[PDB]
Amino acid sequence: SVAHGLAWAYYIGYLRLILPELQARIRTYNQHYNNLLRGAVSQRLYILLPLDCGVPDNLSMADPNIRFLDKLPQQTIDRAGIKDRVYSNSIYELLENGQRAGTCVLEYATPLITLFAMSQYSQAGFSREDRLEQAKLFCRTLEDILADAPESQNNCRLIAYQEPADDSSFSLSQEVLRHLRQ
Amino acid sequence: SVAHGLAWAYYIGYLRLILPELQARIRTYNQHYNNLLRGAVSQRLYILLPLDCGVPDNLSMADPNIRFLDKLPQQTIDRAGIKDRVYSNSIYELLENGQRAGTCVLEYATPLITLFAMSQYSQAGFSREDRLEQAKLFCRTLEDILADAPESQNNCRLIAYQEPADDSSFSLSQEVLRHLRQ
Numbered sequence: 001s002v003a004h005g006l007a008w009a010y011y012i013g014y015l016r017l018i019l020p021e022l023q024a025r026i027r028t029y030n031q032h033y034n035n036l037l038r039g040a041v042s043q044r045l046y047i048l049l050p051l052d053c054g055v056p057d058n059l060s061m062a063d064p065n066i067r068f069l070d071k072l073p074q075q076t077i078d079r080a081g082i083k084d085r086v087y088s089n090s091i092y093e094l095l096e097n098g099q100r101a102g103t104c105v106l107e108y109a110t111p112l113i114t115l116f117a118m119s120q121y122s123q124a125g126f127s128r129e130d131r132l133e134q135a136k137l138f139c140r141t142l143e144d145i146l147a148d149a150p151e152s153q154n155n156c157r158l159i160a161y162q163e164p165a166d167d168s169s170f171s172l173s174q175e176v177l178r179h180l181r182q
Numbered sequence: 183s184v185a186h187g188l189a190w191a192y193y194i195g196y197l198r199l200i201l202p203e204l205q206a207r208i209r210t211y212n213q214h215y216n217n218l219l220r221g222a223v224s225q226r227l228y229i230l231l232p233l234d235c236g237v238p239d240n241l242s243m244a245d246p247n248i249r250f251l252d253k254l255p256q257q258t259i260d261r262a263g264i265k266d267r268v269y270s271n272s273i274y275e276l277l278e279n280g281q282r283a284g285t286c287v288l289e290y291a292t293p294l295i296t297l298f299a300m301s302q303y304s305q306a307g308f309s310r311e312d313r314l315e316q317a318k319l320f321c322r323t324l325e326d327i328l329a330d331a332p333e334s335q336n337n338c339r340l341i342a343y344q345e346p347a348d349d350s351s352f353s354l355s356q357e358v359l360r361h362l363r364q
């Protein structure tokens with residue numbers, strides 16, 4: 001199964017690398033730019049999982065109620081298969097009814113890009129129906145990995161959603177706010 | 183298939199983001215530091231694919247006839263799912279009888295880390311035998327992808343190899359040089 005392997009790859013090649021020092025990075029940021037923030041970023045990493053596998057080029061453009069505010073200070077990673085790579089995470093403001101309702105570190109799950117690409121390329125032998133099935137499977141597998149994972153406790157949140165196409169009353173910031181509220 | 187999706191993920195999420203500007207980065211290196219390197223690094227990316235999926239902490243330590251020389255100039259990435267990310271590549275010295283015999287951009291394919299991990303974790307439901315079969319299928323699938331991929335014509339080379347178990351005296355250094363010499 002591609003989703004099974006993708007979930008493990010996403011965990012092994014990203015999440016178990018980024019999550020250990022994430023809560024430290026967020027506390028550090030909440031220390032030094034506190035005068036600037038007049039608030040506090042939340043502790044967890046919020047990962048967007050659109051089931052249609054539609055990943056935009058820029059998250060800032062994706063919803064007018066989600067707004068880029070700041071970068072976390074970087075993290076260079078020193079491991080096998082990874083040498084001197086610079087990882088950065090972005091911090092977003094979430095608006096509700098014109099007002100700031102939350103601030104969190106937020107990003108899309110990259111393997112959805114691969115699932116989407118696989119459905120476009122004929123050499124991959126992957127249909128658009130295969131795609132939705134695999135995306136749900138990817139979400140559930142990853143969910144299960146993180147439940148039992150030493151690195152993943154209390155510091156990572158999966159936000160999976162299906163977007164109606166295309167009455168489009170959907171709000172991405174509403175969906176994130178629903179998880180943030182806890 | 184796990185390998186099928188890992189190969190596509192490696193192409194979609196690394197190789198096609200890195201290959202397009204590789205030669206230019208190398209060409210550019212062969213100038214600014216031509217006086218420092220006193221030679222030339224070859225222009226392709228050499229990807230090591232150990233079938234036993236053993237990927238070392240430091241390649242430099244996998245064979246002592248493989249020594250780290252220098253880093254390439256950095257590339258920043260502007261794609262979807264990957265804003266403000268800094269990628270570097272490494273140049274290695276290959277030794278033969280104590281002297282330099284070649285210079286190349288060299289790295290292990292990361293999905294083999296994932297294949298290895300999956301064989302170690304119960305939750306992955308993935309055996310040692312599953313691992314070797316999938317590693318072979320990964321190489322074949324990746325080959326097929328690169329053969330017809332726009333970004334991957336003539337700037338990439340796969341070095342798949344199987345370590346004998348009888349003699350613990352196989353030479354990665356020599357294997358890489360065997361490809362290099364053409």
Ligand SMILES: Cc1ccc2c(=O)c3cccc(CC(=O)O)c3oc2c1C
Binds near residue numbers: 111262
């Ligand atoms: C741009 C892009 C696209 C797809 C993947 C991916 O499938 C994928 C799968 C497993 C692990 C990674 C590593 C990462 O998210 O940095 C992956 O990264 C991808 C990236 C960076």
Ligand SMILES: Cc1ccc2c(=O)c3cccc(CC(=O)O)c3oc2c1C
Binds near residue numbers: 012081191192
């Ligand atoms: C450290 C590590 C381990 C495993 C993968 C991986 O499986 C994997 C699979 C597909 C794509 C990527 C992205 C990359 O190699 O930068 C992947 O990256 C990994 C990395 C960076």
